[PDB]
């Protein structure tokens, strides 16, 4: 079935700006990660954990189902200029070994606990994953 929907945590709706770019109501957004956060009274179970494992499972669109994969978390990696954004450096990226296609973007990667990041980047035999951990209500401050 259709699994293409945004994520709502408590009162923060996280989604891809390059796939949403809504009005100017978005509370805060980080162009560096092309992620936006809006407000709403539609709280969901979506609660990013405090750990971002490496070997998990992401929703593979090529097989229309979750598949086991292994990505390595990186404090920051270079993102070659593309249709999304120009050349720069991102933060919290999980690069692994998997197929990539124009649409697979958005695949949530569940680990020992659960979703730890979605597909934000993709390359040859390599798939990046935006770590949602370093953003949610894990601690903040400092
Ligand atoms: Zn974990």
């Amino acid at each position: 079935g259709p699994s293409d929907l945004f994520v709502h945590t408590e009162q923060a709706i996280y989604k891809n700006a390059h796939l949403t770019t809504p009005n100017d109501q978005t509370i805060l957004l980080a162009l560096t990660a092309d992620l936006q956060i809006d407000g709403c009274d539609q709280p969901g179970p979506d609660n990013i954990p405090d750990c971002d494992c490496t070997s998990g499972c992401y929703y593979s669109r090529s097989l229309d189902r979750y598949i086991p994969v292994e990505c390595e978390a990186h404090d920051w990696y270079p993102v070659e200029e593309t249709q999304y954004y120009p050349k720069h450096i991102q933060y919290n990226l999980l690069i692994g070994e998997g197929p990539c296609v124009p649409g697979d973007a958005g695949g949530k990667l569940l680990c020992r606990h659960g979703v730890i990041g979605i597909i934000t980047a993709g390359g040859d035999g390599h798939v990046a994953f935006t770590d949602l951990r370093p953003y949610n209500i894990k601690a903040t401050s400092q």
Side-chain angles (χ1 to χ4, degrees):
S3 344
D4 43 271
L5 254 150
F6 314 133
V7 189
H8 335 127
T9 66
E10 326 313 286
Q11 202 197 347
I13 286 69
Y14 296 72
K15 49 190 208 262
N16 270 90
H18 188 58
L19 255 154
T20 64
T21 175
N23 228 246
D24 212 307
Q25 263 277 341
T26 18
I27 296 115
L28 186 133
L29 81 90
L31 303 97
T32 32
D34 285 38
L35 171 52
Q36 296 170 319
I37 302 160
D38 223 325
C40 228
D41 317 84
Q42 322 177 313
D46 316 273
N47 203 18
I48 303 130
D50 87 307
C51 155
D52 56 298
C53 301
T54 48
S55 31
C57 58
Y58 96 92
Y59 211 138
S60 78
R61 292 298 220 162
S62 168
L63 304 318
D64 185 56
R65 48 123 59 193
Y66 263 82
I67 74 183
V69 303
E70 182 188 61
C71 313
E72 49 171 17
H74 277 308
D75 219 56
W76 55 264
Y77 242 62
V79 44
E80 45 139 59
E81 68 183 46
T82 358
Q83 239 191 63
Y84 302 89
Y85 263 66
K87 232 296 168 116
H88 233 42
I89 312 301
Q90 253 196 258
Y91 318 129
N92 328 126
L93 299 146
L94 261 107
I95 283 288
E97 210 189 320
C100 72
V101 284
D104 241 320
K108 317 215 85 195
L109 172 79
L110 277 115
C111 76
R112 299 293 219 166
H113 335 312
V115 176
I116 40 174
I118 61 166
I119 320 189
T120 185
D124 272 84
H126 285 90
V127 55
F129 277 81
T130 173
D131 225 37
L132 310 148
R133 148 166 180 286
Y135 227 117
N136 217 34
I137 309 301
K138 55 117 168 219
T140 344
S141 212
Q142 252 227 112

